[PDB]
């Protein structure tokens, strides 16, 4: 019954379900609704010591842990969800991406040209949607599915 890569799973503090997309690790209280050729999307990327290229426009040499980058950008998620901040917003500002100058924007691709994990949440998120934290060689990205 689920869309790729959902399952249902039970919440440690509420005792609630809730549904996680093991691809893309999005999680949410609600049921998922529901492959093109091409998909657009926008990112934030977190760079941390063990990245590729350890450095960015905002910082020449990245130092922060891979574990330290895990948070900042489940503190971005937090406030994406709530409101208080827009996702272009903080990729414009934070992003350790030269695509931060864009609001994240990436342009349209096809499968074949990222990065497996990030192609593969891509591809698994429906227009409108937003992954959760998403590991590649790059750092750690969150991903906004915008056509
Ligand atoms: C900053 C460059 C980068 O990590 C990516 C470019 C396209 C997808 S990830």
């Not at 959902?6 to 609704?33: C, D, L």
């Not at 760079?47 to 950008?73: D, F, V, Y």
Request: one cysteine or more; glycine letters at 8%.
């Amino acid at each position: 019954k689920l869309p790729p890569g959902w399952e249902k799973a039970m919440s440690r503090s509420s005792g609630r379900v809730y549904y996680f997309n093991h691809i893309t690790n999005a999680s949410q209280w609600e049921r998922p609704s529901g492959e093109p050729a091409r998909v657009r999307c926008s990112h934030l990327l977190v760079k941390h010591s063990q990245s590729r290229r350890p450095s960015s426009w905002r910082q020449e040499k990245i130092t922060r842990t891979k574990e330290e980058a895990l948070e900042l950008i489940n503190g971005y998620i937090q406030k994406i969800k709530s409101g208080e901040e827009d996702f272009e917003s903080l990729a414009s500002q934070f992003s350790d991406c030269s695509s931060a100058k864009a609001r994240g924007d990436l342009g349209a691709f096809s499968r074949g040209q990222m990065q497996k994990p990030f192609e593969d949440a891509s591809f698994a998120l429906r227009t409108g949607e937003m992954s959760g934290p998403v590991f590649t060689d790059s750092g750690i990205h969150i991903i906004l599915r915008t056509e």
